[PDB]
């Protein structure tokens, strides 16, 4: 109904931007000790 | 009347830093010696402070 959402800049940061009716999948990277090491290529899911 | 070489970006401040004018405005009456120092350093490459 009158549901409301409270955005948190400090936890999240500047949110991504995507557009209407475009096929998109996110790109995810694996970090070890604060260093970019490899893009993640395994099966993953997203949710709300 | 004295300025510097670069800006807040082009050095890497992700978030709002601490500058001389804001620190002076922060401390009202105390001499300049106790206004800004290593007991009051907050880094700017921060994202969370
Ligand atoms: C002399 O003064 C200069 C500035 O004038 C200092 O230079 C900077 O020093 C920083 C500390 O060593 C360097 O650290 C950067 O910090 C960033 C922190 O961001 C993190 O982000 C994650 C999320 O991803 C958060 O969880 C964390 O909490 C942090 O918020 C890093 O992102 C950054 O990594 C890269 O930096 C390069 C710099 O070219 C960027 O191109 C890149 O996009 C990415 O941001 C880095 O770790 C900082 O790099 C450095 N800047 C420069 C221009 O050199 C010197 O450290 C001072 N001298 C001494 C001896 O301290
Ligand atoms: C700030 O001004 C100085 C001028 O002193 C610029 O320093 C130059 O930096 C480049 C980069 O390596 C050097 O190759 C030059 O030799 C430097 N010049 C001098 C005279 O030392 C610096 O680029 C300026 N910074 C910004 C952000 O504009």
How far is B14 from A44, CA to CA, in rounded Å? 30
Resolution of the entry in angstroms: 3.9
**Cβ atoms of residues A39 and A29 within 8 Å:** yes
How far apart, in Å, are the Cα atoms of A8 and each of A2, A13, A21, A30?
20, 8, 27, 24
Show the CA angle centred on residue B10, arms to residues A38 and B38, nearest 5°. Answer: 95
Match 């500047």 to its residue by tokens: A14
Indicate which atom in ligand 2 lies nearest the CA of residue B11: 27
3-state secondary structure B22-48: HHHHHCCCCCHHHCCCCCCCCCCCCCC
Q: Does A13 touch chain B (CB under 8 A)?
A: yes
Ligand nearest to the CA of B11: 1
How far is A28 from A40, CA to CA, in rounded Å? 6
DSSP letter (8 states) at residue A14: S
How far is A9 from B48, CA to CA, in rounded Å? 9
């Amino acid at each position: 109904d009158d549901l409301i959402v409270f955005y948190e800049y400090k936890d999240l940061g500047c949110p991504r931007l995507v557009y209407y009716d475009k096929p998109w999948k996110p790109v995810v990277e694996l970090w070890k000790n604060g260093i970019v090491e490899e893009i993640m290529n395994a099966e993953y899911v997203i949710s709300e | 009347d004295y300025t510097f070489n670069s800006t807040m970006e082009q050095n890497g401040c992700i978030n709002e830093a601490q500058t001389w004018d804001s620190m002076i405005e922060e401390n009202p009456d105390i001499p300049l010696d106790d206004v800004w120092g290593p007991q009051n350093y907050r880094p700017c490459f921060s994202y969370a402070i």
